[PDB]
Amino acid sequence: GVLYVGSKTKEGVVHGVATVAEKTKEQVTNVGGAVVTGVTAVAQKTVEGAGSIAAATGFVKKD
Amino acid sequence: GVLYVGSKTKEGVVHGVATVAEKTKEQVTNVGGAVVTGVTAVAQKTVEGAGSIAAATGFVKKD
Amino acid sequence: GVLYVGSKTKEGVVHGVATVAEKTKEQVTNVGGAVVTGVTAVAQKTVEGAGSIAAATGFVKKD
Amino acid sequence: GVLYVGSKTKEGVVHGVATVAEKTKEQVTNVGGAVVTGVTAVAQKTVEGAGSIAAATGFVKKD
Amino acid sequence: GVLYVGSKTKEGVVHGVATVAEKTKEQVTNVGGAVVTGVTAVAQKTVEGAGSIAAATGFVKKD
Amino acid sequence: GVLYVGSKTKEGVVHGVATVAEKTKEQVTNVGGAVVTGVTAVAQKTVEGAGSIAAATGFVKKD
């Protein structure tokens, strides 16, 4: 179907994904999949059919 | 169907996903899947059919 | 069906997902799935059919 | 002496001298002398000594 | 003496002297002398000593 | 004396002297003398001593 996205913006500031760590021992940072950001952000039909986004984090630490 | 998204904004500030950790030992940060952010954010039909977003975090620590 | 989203905003400030941790030992942060944020945020038909978003956190710690 | 004029303004709109006439026969418009206008308007020591501003209008119409 | 004029403005709109006449027979427009206008308008010591600004309008119409 | 004129402006619009006449028979327009206009307008010591600005308009019409 028709999807109209109109916008008349002025002085637009956008921050996306932020991450801060400090005084840590082990650091893991997994980002992605469908990260869309911006003044005019559109994300249509991310997954269709048998598709998948397995954005996991297999932290095992088999001590 | 028709989806109209009109906007007349001025001086728009948007912050998305934020994460802060301090004095930690183990750090895990998993972000994503359908992270959409911004002054005009649209997310239509994220999942259709047999699709999936398994944005999990397999923290085991098999001590 | 028709979905009209009109907006006439001025000086709009939006904060999305925030997380703060301090003096912790183990840190886990799982975010996502359908995180939409912004001055004009629209999220239509997140899941249709047999789809799913298994945004879980398998914290085991099998001590 | 010290004259401090501080200002922290945002979106300032200033209109000065306005004059509107309609369906008239004789029109006279005399403006001036010390017309100061604006967001930060300062007018110090307009007249000192034997000076003068004879901003008059000698409309006679000696019929 | 010291005269400090500080200003931190944003989106400043200033209009000075305006004059509108319509359907008139005789039109006279005399402007000036010390017409100062603007976002940061300063007018110091306009007249000193025996000086003068004779911004008059000698409309006689000796009928 | 010291005269400090500081300014930190953004998107500054300034209009000076304006004059509009319509459907008139006789038109006279005298402007000047010390017409200063602008975003940072300064007019110091316009007249000193025996000086003068005779910005008049000798409209006689000796009918």
Swiss-Prot record, chains A, B, C, D, E, F:
Sequence repeats lie at residues 7-21, 22-32. Highly expressed in presynaptic terminals in the central nervous system. Expressed principally in brain. Residues 1-32 are annotated as: 4 X 11 AA tandem repeats of [EGS]-K-T-K-[EQ]-[GQ]-V-X(4). The modification Phosphoserine is found at residue 52. Changing residue 11 to K: In PARK1 and DLB; significant increase in binding to negatively charged phospholipid liposomes; increases oligomerization. It comes from the Eukaryota. Cu cation binds at residue 15. Changing residue 15 to Q: In PARK1; no effect on protein structure; no effect on phosphorylation of the protein; no effect on membrane- and lipid-binding; increases oligomerization; increases fibril formation; increases secretion of the protein; impairs copper-binding. Transmembrane segments: none annotated. It is found in: Cytoplasm; Membrane; Nucleus; Synapse. Phosphorylated, predominantly on serine residues. Phosphorylation by CK1 appears to occur on residues distinct from the residue phosphorylated by other kinases. It is linked to Genetic alterations of SNCA resulting in aberrant polymerization into fibrils, are associated with several neurodegenerative diseases (synucleinopathies). SNCA fibrillar aggregates represent the major non A-beta component of Alzheimer disease amyloid plaque, and a major component of Lewy body inclusions. They are also found within Lewy body (LB)-like intraneuronal inclusions, glial inclusions and axonal spheroids in neurodegeneration with brain iron accumulation type 1. Parkinson disease 1, autosomal dominant: A complex neurodegenerative disorder characterized by bradykinesia, resting tremor, muscular rigidity and postural instability. Additional features are characteristic postural abnormalities, dysautonomia, dystonic cramps, and dementia. The pathology of Parkinson disease involves the loss of dopaminergic neurons in the substantia nigra and the presence of Lewy bodies (intraneuronal accumulations of aggregated proteins), in surviving neurons in various areas of the brain. Belongs to the synuclein family. Soluble monomer. Homotetramer. A dynamic intracellular population of tetramers and monomers coexists normally and the tetramer plays an essential role in maintaining homeostasis. Interacts with UCHL1. Interacts with phospholipase D and histones. Interacts (via N-terminus) with synphilin-1/SNCAIP; this interaction promotes formation of SNCA inclusions in the cytoplasm. Interacts with CALM1. Interacts with STXBP1; this interaction controls SNCA self-replicating aggregation. Interacts with SNARE components VAMP2 and SNAP25; these interactions allows SNARE complex assembly and integrity. The 'non A-beta component of Alzheimer disease amyloid plaque' domain (NAC domain) is involved in fibrils formation. The middle hydrophobic region forms the core of the filaments. The C-terminus may regulate aggregation and determine the diameter of the filaments. Neuronal protein that plays several roles in synaptic activity such as regulation of synaptic vesicle trafficking and subsequent neurotransmitter release. Participates as a monomer in synaptic vesicle exocytosis by enhancing vesicle priming, fusion and dilation of exocytotic fusion pores. Mechanistically, acts by increasing local Ca(2+) release from microdomains which is essential for the enhancement of ATP-induced exocytosis. This is Alpha-synuclein. It comes from Homo sapiens. The chain holds residues 36 to 98 of 140 of the full protein.
